[PDB]
Amino acid sequence: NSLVCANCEGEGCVACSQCKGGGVNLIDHFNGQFKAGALCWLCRGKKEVLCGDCNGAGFIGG
Numbered sequence: 001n002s003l004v005c006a007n008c009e010g011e012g013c014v015a016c017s018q019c020k021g022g023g024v025n026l027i028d029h030f031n032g033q034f035k036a037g038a039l040c041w042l043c044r045g046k047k048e049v050l051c052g053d054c055n056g057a058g059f060i061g062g
């Protein structure tokens with residue numbers, strides 16, 4: 001059976017973990033290519049992504 005996802009609490013989407021919901025990179029990255037203050041490499045300014053644990057379902061199966 002399904003359980004509501006403990007990581008997002010059912011939201012499915014979550015705040016982007018890279019920019020923390022601000023939309024821009026917070027650091028110059030170790031790769032040398034993502035710059036602090038540029039558009040977030042992961043969410044491209046949308047400020048959210050899908051939850052990694054449930055892939056956006058909000059629930060986990062049995």
Ligand SMILES: [Zn+2]
Pocket residue numbers: 005006007008009010012051052053054055056057058059
């Ligand atoms: Zn989730």
Ligand SMILES: [Zn+2]
Pocket residue numbers: 011012013014015048
């Ligand atoms: Zn959301």
Ligand SMILES: [Zn+2]
Pocket residue numbers: 016017018019020021023024040041042043044045046047048
């Ligand atoms: Zn982001």
